[PDB]
Design a protein around this ligand. Sequence first.
Ligand SMILES: Nc1nc2c(ncn2[C@H]2C[C@H](O)[C@@H](COP(=O)(O)OP(=O)(O)OP(=O)(O)O)O2)c(=O)[nH]1
Ligand SMILES: [Mg+2]
Ligand SMILES: [Mg+2]
Ligand SMILES: [Mg+2]
Ligand code: NA
Length: 328
Amino acid sequence: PAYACQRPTPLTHHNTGLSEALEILAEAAGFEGSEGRLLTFCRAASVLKALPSPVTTLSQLQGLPHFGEHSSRVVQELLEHGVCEEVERVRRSERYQTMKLFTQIFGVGVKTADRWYREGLRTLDDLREQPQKLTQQQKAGLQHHQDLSTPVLRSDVDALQQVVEEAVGQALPGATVTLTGGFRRGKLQGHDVDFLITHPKEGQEAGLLPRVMCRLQDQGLILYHQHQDAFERSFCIFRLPQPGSWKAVRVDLVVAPVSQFPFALLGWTGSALFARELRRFSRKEKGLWLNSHGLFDPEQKTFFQAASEEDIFRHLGLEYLPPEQRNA
DNA sequence: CGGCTTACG
DNA sequence: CGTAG
DNA sequence: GCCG
Ligand SMILES: Nc1nc2c(ncn2[C@H]2C[C@H](O)[C@@H](COP(=O)(O)OP(=O)(O)OP(=O)(O)O)O2)c(=O)[nH]1
Ligand SMILES: [Mg+2]
Ligand SMILES: [Mg+2]
Ligand SMILES: [Mg+2]
Ligand code: NA
């Protein structure tokens, strides 16, 4: 099938080298603002992740969605020579290396990275020499860059979840914390930890996240957050115990009312490409508008109610995929 | 040819 | 603009 | 870059 949400995609697969090459090209297309090319290379990489066995000859690409002349030539060169000249040229290019370095910073996206590149900046130390060019968010991302470039381990996640649950429980008894994002999909490491918070009584979650953040702040556990008036998402930097020391870790906290929790869980569990393809499928194939708050029928002007992710897959006519099979 | 993403901070 | 490579 |  053509859409990633129509097929299981496990975390580990049989075409790792091929998919990683196409994702280099996708990433480079994004750095140049070519959103269409980025999508195609991302989708072509995701198709290979979903295959049941390694691709060893060009003929196996026949009939595969999102493989045309360019992606097929990349695979053919990898199969024949072990390396694709285009991919290698991208890897060592000054533009790709710098855009990757700059966009990796918390608070810096492609547009900011590109402007800094055009102004001649190239290294983290170049940015540090120009603090007037930085927001407070970017200052935090720059100062914590080394820790934030170290993968968070699954062992780290359980201790973090306990401390978030502690603060959430004092902010609002009965509220729950659910691990989302890549760790819910089975990843053993990540760039951050993602949590979704709710409460079983609709409406009781209103105003919760400011109360949670203030309690974590008082514990000395928040190295950075955007409110250090009402908000429901926080993208922060946590202080996480280490042996004889501590390390900075990115943590995302999202609050949703229980009526919307299945949609938020589906959206924030990802993968980013999985969720993007699920929304594209919903709109284009089923005529329904999906987001992290609900699922809208624009003809009937009605929202579907969902009590589970299983509800939503059924509403969309899709076979259910557990989180470990959404690694598109 | 047009289409290819969201809400919230 | 950033969360968001 | 690929699809419909
Ligand atoms: N619309 C949109 N949502 C995004 C994007 N990047 C992340 N998200 C949202 C939706 C994803 O399901 C959710 C989780 O993605 P994360 O950035 O936390 O990454 P993930 O946990 O998949 O892996 P990682 O943290 O890198 O180990 O965040 C993006 O580029 N666009
Ligand atoms: Mg994550
Ligand atoms: Mg995250
Ligand atoms: Mg962006
Ligand atoms: Na960034």
